[PDB]
Design a protein around this nucleic acid. Structure first.
Ligand SMILES: [Mg+2]
Ligand SMILES: [Mg+2]
Ligand SMILES: [Mg+2]
Ligand SMILES: [Mg+2]
Ligand SMILES: [Mg+2]
Ligand SMILES: [Mg+2]
Ligand SMILES: [Mg+2]
Ligand SMILES: [Mg+2]
Ligand SMILES: [Mg+2]
Ligand SMILES: [Mg+2]
Ligand SMILES: [Zn+2]
Lengths: 151, 60, 204, 118, 128, 83, 98
RNA sequence: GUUGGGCACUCUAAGGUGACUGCCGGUGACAAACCGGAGGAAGGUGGGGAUGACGUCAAAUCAUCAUGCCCCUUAUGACCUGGGCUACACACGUGCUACAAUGGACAGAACAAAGGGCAGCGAAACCGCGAGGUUAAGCCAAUCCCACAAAUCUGUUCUCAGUUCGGAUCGCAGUCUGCAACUCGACUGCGUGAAGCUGGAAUCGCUAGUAAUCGCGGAUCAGCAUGCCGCGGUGAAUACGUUCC
């Protein structure tokens, strides 16, 4: 808004892992204010991570974020009669936001039947430095570096 | 309403199902409230005059 | 676009005219009161009546009339008031007790003031004169403010318009401000003129 | 297995598979199996010849398939023959149950055939 | 008994919390908390005042909660515990107030307004 | 669908006319405005001329028409396509 | 026991009329329970503000009905006829469950 | 909570108190103010409502009502029955329900608010698969009834299918109101099981208890609401910024 920056509302950390970083994810995944369903999926998905790997799910999840979270993004800019996608440094706050959004979005587009599996499988893919949410982070970087000229 | 229509509403009809409300002030058929037996227009006016007991502009 | 000033203030600083509770009979009583207030207004047209408070308790109707000419309403001892009472007993079919109070300064009662202007407009007085004079007389009676408006085909004009005059303060948004308000009409040969009057007597 | 001249789905449960017969829905499929005394959870492929036999005998009493389709056809045919309002709605391909037709009669009417506006 | 009372409120909920000494048994209308409030996340929030004061496994929380929904009541109980702990030890005020557990959460359902579809949600506009 | 406890509805005026014809073997056109009247079994063979809104439509009764209201054979609106 | 229900639209005249009944009970000698405020019955009326069209333009009116309950435990014959003496103002409705 | 008993607590609702940049520091004309801090349930017009200046659009309304002028006055007035306002090649606006597995079905636990009720609300009981029926307790109501919250949670089953998705359309048989449900009511049962696999150009709402989603009540009303006006339940994301629209 015009007046200035606004007080960013805080979320509580969570009754298992004690993680603000992962309460956010319930809220990204939540639909129609059904927080229970999203909690259930999350927690089920994290069990599935722990069984397949052996490592702590939280850990794999935070490894996964690092690979999904972008650093540079282009931004649409009309100058004259042609657009110049201008590269910008992503703010630390926005990095997480784009991290979780892409995780949740591309999780839902997977072909696995249940969401807990789709989420889990997508979280594992990011840790493997491949998948859809990673390919998104690759493609945002490619565009940013392609338009490195501008500043 | 027409005088005929007001009269015919006041007369007892052939069947009770045929019986309908009008505004007792102005004879309007639509939007007649049963508590007051007034249409929405007449109700507003008389409420503003303080001539409908206990009725005041609401806000919450 | 402007709310009725009386309407805004009822149950705040103003009080209801009809001062009675009912549950079952509420609609029946309401249309009795309408029939009364109609009748009183028709009969006591020239007698400078404004408010007509109505109260009820059992088969009984207490009618506190407010008038600037109480002698004209009452008449010779209590001749005309009894003729009114007996006429209301025909309409109501109840006991009708009629109190009659005085308005001390009739230029502070909005309804009287509005009707004055309306009567003058029917008698072919210039809307400019009719208004301007009342503005003075209300201010003389010690009103803290007064607005008056006359609207319609002023001076038998083809195009209607609203000329208005004001004096002092009339703070319509201030809720505790006792702002009396009233309207009246004048059936001229070029249709209806309409009057409106705001009188600010003071704070509460 | 074929029932009432219909090869029902083998891999599905019997309550569901019975509804593939015209004239049977979930309640009818429940009320037959109850009368047979077959479990609702059992697959069609994992029925015994005893169970199928008992089911067949029950369904043979119920009016299904062509028996039913003929009944429905004659009902609608009757309405047309007598020239009832409903019959006229049946032949003209419009709502028969008072549904308004200025909009949204597409199930009866079929897909749109657009015409030039004024 | 040495009960410490504290009323709590959220949305339409009203908790009547009572901190009797014991070993951390929250009792909500003659039940265990897990029976009444199924969510793990809400139970943690109810513990939040007890965990900061370090009186988890010290008082048994006896509750008579009414109105609102499961979360509403969860938040009401939290406010009631917090206010009960002020009677227990007034020095806990400093730590409770820091966390912000001594605020009646004044977020209430905004009224539906005529012309609008909800409180804020306006009907679908078209210029044509 | 009218309740069974009430039983099938018919206007007295209509029924009386048709019953009056059923006293003998008389057959005449019973012009009427009672579209709401059910076609009773004892109507069969008569020619009831039902009012559609602007005229009496003649309706010869059949066995299949029993159960239906007289109005069902006297359609009120006039439609014969757009363009 | 005697029981008194008061209903009025204005709460000021209700509490005045309530205090009269409380005062009248104490002078008569009977024990007073006191004026218990029962919940207010708020009816609400939304109407169209305009005479024609303008559906989204409304006006909302309300009728609040305030209620008081006075019980009188252990009465005496003067107390019953003492409630006859109060000709309470119009706008307050009375009901006696003696 | 049923009783006795108490009114503690909650609640009800009358009267008060409380928030004023009042206090602390900094920046600021030493002003106005602003930025942060304390205390506080609340902090900077705390949230929301009511409240709508002079005027603008010869904007809307002669069909609420009133009214000048004009017109009709065995008719443009009045009474009736039936029909129509529900028509259907089609085009647009606003909505509802969906297109499914964050789901469907089935089963078991729960947790609301605000309203309405006198010829009106009608419990329980019994009968009916059900809509409902018969009978009838209580309540002119913080007492009784409407009334059952539903999303949710926990099981079980279905396992990606135009399907156990979806529920249009149509047939049959009913229920209720009503003098009467053909045109033209709602609801129920059984059968039927359409389109639809998230929608081109484009376009709308919303900054927080909001949006989104889930039920509940009310006016009108015999009956008839996906509409409207209210009510609570669960409950987000994001706001860098002001270039552009
Ligand atoms: Mg009617
Ligand atoms: Mg219809
Ligand atoms: Mg609208
Ligand atoms: Mg501060
Ligand atoms: Mg203001
Ligand atoms: Mg115009
Ligand atoms: Mg229409
Ligand atoms: Mg289904
Ligand atoms: Mg805003
Ligand atoms: Mg209704
Ligand atoms: Zn009216």
């Amino acid at each position: 808004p015009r007046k200035g920056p606004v007080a960013k509302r805080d979320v509580l950390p969570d009754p298992i892992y004690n993680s603000k970083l992962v309460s956010r994810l319930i809220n990204k995944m939540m639909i129609d204010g059904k927080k229970g369903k999203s909690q259930t999926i999350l927690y089920k998905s994290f069990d599935i991570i722990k069984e397949r790997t052996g490592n702590d799910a939280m850990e794999v999840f935070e490894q996964a974020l690092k690979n999904i979270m972008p650093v540079l993004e282009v931004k649409a800019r009309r100058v004259g009669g042609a657009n110049y996608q201008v590269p910008v440094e992503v703010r630390p706050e926005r990095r997480t936001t784009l991290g979780l959004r892409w995780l949740v979005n591309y999780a839902r587009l997977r072909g696995e039947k249940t969401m807990e599996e789709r989420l889990a499988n997508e979280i594992l893919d990011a840790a493997n430095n491949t998948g859809a949410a990673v390919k998104k982070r690759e493609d945002t970087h490619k565009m940013a570096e392609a338009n490195k000229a501008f500043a | 309403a027409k005088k005929s229509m007001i009269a015919k509403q006041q007369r007892t009809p052939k069947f009770k199902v045929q019986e309908y409300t009008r505004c007792e002030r102005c004879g309007r058929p639509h939007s007649v409230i049963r508590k007051f037996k007034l249409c929405r227009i007449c109700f507003r006016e008389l409420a503003y005059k303080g001539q409908i007991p206990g009725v005041k502009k609401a806000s919450w | 676009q402007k709310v009725n000033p009386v309407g805004l203030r009822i149950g705040v600083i103003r009080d209801w005219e009809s001062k009675w509770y009912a549950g079952k009979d509420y609609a029946d009583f309401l249309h009795e009161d309408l029939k009364i207030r109609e009748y009183i207004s028709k009969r006591l047209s020239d007698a400078s009546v404004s408010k007509v408070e109505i109260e009820r308790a059992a088969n009984r109707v207490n009618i506190t009339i407010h008038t600037a000419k109480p002698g004209m309403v009452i008449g010779k001892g209590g001749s005309e008031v009894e003729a009114l009472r007996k006429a209301l007993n025909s309409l109501t079919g109840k006991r009708v007790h009629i109190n009659i109070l005085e308005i001390k300064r009739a230029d502070l009662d909005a309804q009287l003031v509005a009707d004055n202007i309306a009567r003058q407009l029917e008698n072919r007085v210039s809307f400019r004169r009719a208004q301007k004079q009342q503005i003075q007389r209300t201010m003389r009676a010690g009103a803290q403010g007064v607005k008056t408006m006359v609207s319609g085909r002023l001076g038998g004009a083809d195009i209607a318009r609203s000329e208005y005059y004001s004096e002092g303060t009339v703070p319509l948004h201030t809720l505790r401000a006792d702002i009396d308000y009233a309207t009246s009409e004048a059936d001229t040969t070029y249709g209806k003129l309409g009057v409106k009057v705001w009188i600010y007597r003071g704070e509460v | 297995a074929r029932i009432a001249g219909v090869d029902i789905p083998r891999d599905k449960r019997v309550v569901i598979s019975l509804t593939y017969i015209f004239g049977i829905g979930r309640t009818t499929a429940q009320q037959v199996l109850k009368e047979a005394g077959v479990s609702e959870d059992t697959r069609v492929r994992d029925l015994t010849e005893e169970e199928l036999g008992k089911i067949r005998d029950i369904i043979d009493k119920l009016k299904v398939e062509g028996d039913l389709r003929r009944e429905v056809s004659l009902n609608i045919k009757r309405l047309i023959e007598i020239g009832s309002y409903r019959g006229i709605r049946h032949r003209r391909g419009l709502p028969v149950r008072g549904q308004n037709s200025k909009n949204n009669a597409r199930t009866r009417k079929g897909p749109r055939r657009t015409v030039a506006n004024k | 008994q040495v009960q410490y009372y504290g009323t709590g409120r959220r949305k339409s909920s009203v908790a009547r919390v009572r901190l009797v000494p014991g070993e951390g048994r929250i009792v909500v209308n003659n039940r265990e908390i897990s029976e009444h409030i199924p969510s793990a996340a809400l139970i943690e929030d109810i513990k939040q005042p007890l965990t900061l004061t370090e009186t988890a496994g010290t008082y048994d929380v006896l509750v008579n909660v009414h109105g609102g929904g499961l979360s509403g009541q969860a938040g009401a109980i939290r406010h009631g515990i917090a206010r009960a702990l002020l009677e227990a030890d007034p020095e806990y005020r400093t730590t409770l107030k820091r966390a912000g557990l001594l605020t009646r959460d004044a977020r209430m359902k905004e009224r539906k307004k005529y012309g609008l579809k909800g409180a804020r949600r306006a009907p679908q506009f078209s210029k044509r | 669908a009218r309740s069974l406890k009430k039983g099938p509805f018919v206007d007295g005026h209509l029924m009386t006319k048709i019953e009056k014809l059923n006293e003998t073997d008389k057959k005449q056109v019973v012009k009427t405005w009672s579209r709401r009247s059910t076609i009773f079994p004892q109507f069969i063979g008569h020619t009831i001329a039902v009012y559609d809104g602007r005229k009496h439509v003649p309706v010869f009764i059949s066995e299949d028409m029993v159960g239906h209201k007289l109005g069902e054979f006297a359609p009120t609106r006039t439609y014969k396509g757009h363009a | 026991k005697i029981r008194i229900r008061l209903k009025a639209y204005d709460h000021r005249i209700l509490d005045q009329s309530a205090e009269k009944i409380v005062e009248t009970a104490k002078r008569s000698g009977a024990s007073v329970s006191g004026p218990i405020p029962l919940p207010t019955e708020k009816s609400v009326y939304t109407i169209l503000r305009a005479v024609h069209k303008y559906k989204d333009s409304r006006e909302q009116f309300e009728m609040r009905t305030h209620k008081r309950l006075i019980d009188i435990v252990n009465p005496t014959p003067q107390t019953v006829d003492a409630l006859m003496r109060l000709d309470l103002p119009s706008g307050v409705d009375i009901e006696i469950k003696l």
